[PDB]
């Protein structure tokens, strides 16, 4: 719950910061992704790297109790109630020769269970397909490939990689007779047909405003055995641009939401839809005050390596999610936000903005 909060907190403001800069386009993001990745790299660094990254994040990972409760965590979602539905990977690749700290691997794996990846970057196209294949075998070959990493070159020597992959079965499945074609609205004025999935049910449904007053429509979708759920938001009018939404999204709200839903009888009528996002991390965490860690003088990663100077010059996520089938009504004809959250710690795992299915 704490630690799930503060995840949750953290990723939700960098998947702002993604979507503030992505307008009118399809993003797909973790929160609880960044901050897993983020709270590793915070082990590797010092000085003002370090107070950057903790002010941030909200928290520091050395702290008594927080390095068990994010094991407990990552543990809580890869329980037997995942059908191979999600599948998530943490790396840091590190040049090979690289003299490292005493101490510095032993005390990761003590806290994250895992060791940081060590790569010779000077063999450029080997290093490319490691990343890759580390990639591919840890989400189960869903995602095979990075194209970030068509940037790293032999003077890399610090690669921040996180990889997430989502399909999962609804408690409730769409009837597949039930899915036809539809006009969505896109926020440009434009009009395109596509699959629309259909569901007569009792739906957990809220409304909420906007702090300008526009009504915004909240329901909320369960995955089998109640673990998880996803969350459905958008505008009641078709003029309210999504960002009035985006720009007020937070942990908090989305619990908020979840507290105030009752079960209503409703046509829910929603667009399939299959996204995939490769986002550079260093813009949104500059914006988020993590400048120094990307500066060649600047960064601070002397608890990694106090001999040659260290940056990171690639912080990549990369992001798979699928959804697709397995009264008054509710048409999901205008772009939209879906949040994946983890009901029993309350972790948000996935969020994105579908703007065209």
């Known amino acids: 719950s704490y630690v799930a909060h503060l995840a949750s907190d953290f990723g939700v403001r960098v998947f702002q910061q993604v979507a503030q800069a992505s307008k009118d386009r399809n993003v797909v993001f973790s929160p609880y992704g960044v901050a897993s990745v983020l709270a590793m790299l915070q082990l590797t660094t010092g000085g003002e790297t370090q107070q950057q990254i903790q002010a941030a994040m909200g928290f520091k990972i050395d702290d008594k109790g927080m390095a068990p409760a994010l094991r407990h965590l990552y543990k809580e979602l890869m329980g037997p109630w ?3 539905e999600i599948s998530t990977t943490d790396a840091i690749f590190v040049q090979r020769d690289l003299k490292l700290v005493q101490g510095f691997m032993p005390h990761f794996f003590r806290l994250f269970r895992s060791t940081v990846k060590q790569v010779d ?6 290093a490319r397909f490691i990343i890759n294949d580390w990639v591919k075998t840890h989400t189960k070959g869903m995602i095979s490939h990075l194209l970030g990493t068509g940037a790293v070159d032999q003077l890399t020597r610090l690669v921040l990689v996180n990889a997430l992959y989502f399909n999962g079965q609804w408690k409730t499945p769409f009837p597949d007779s039930s899915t036809h074609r539809r006009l969505f609205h896109k926020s440009d004025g434009s009009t395109v047909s596509v699959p629309m999935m259909a569901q007569t049910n009792k739906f957990n449904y809220t409304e909420f405003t906007t702090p300008d007053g526009h009504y915004y429509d909240i329901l ?3 995955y089998h055995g109640d673990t998880l759920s996803m969350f459905i938001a958008a505008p009641y009018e078709k003029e309210v641009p999504l960002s009035a939404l ?12 979840k507290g105030n839903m009752t079960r209503l009888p409703r046509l829910l009528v929603l667009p399939k839809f299959s996204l995939e996002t490769e986002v550079d991390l260093r813009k949104p965490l ?11 003088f600047q960064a601070d990663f002397t608890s990694l390596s106090d001999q040659e100077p260290l940056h990171v010059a690639l912080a990549l996520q990369k992001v798979k999610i699928e959804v697709n089938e397995s009264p008054e009504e509710i048409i999901i004809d205008r772009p939209f936000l879906f949040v994946v959250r983890h009901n029993p710690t309350g972790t948000v795992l996935f969020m994105g903005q579908v703007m065209e299915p």
């Open 246 to 257: 985006t720009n007020i999204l937070s942990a908090q709200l989305i619990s908020h939401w």
């Open 82 to 84: 995942n059908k191979d």
């Open 220 to 222: 909320e979708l369960p």
């Open 286 to 296: 500059e914006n988020l005050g993590m400048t120094d860690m990307f500066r060649q």
């Open 121 to 126: 970057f000077s063999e450029v196209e080997r």
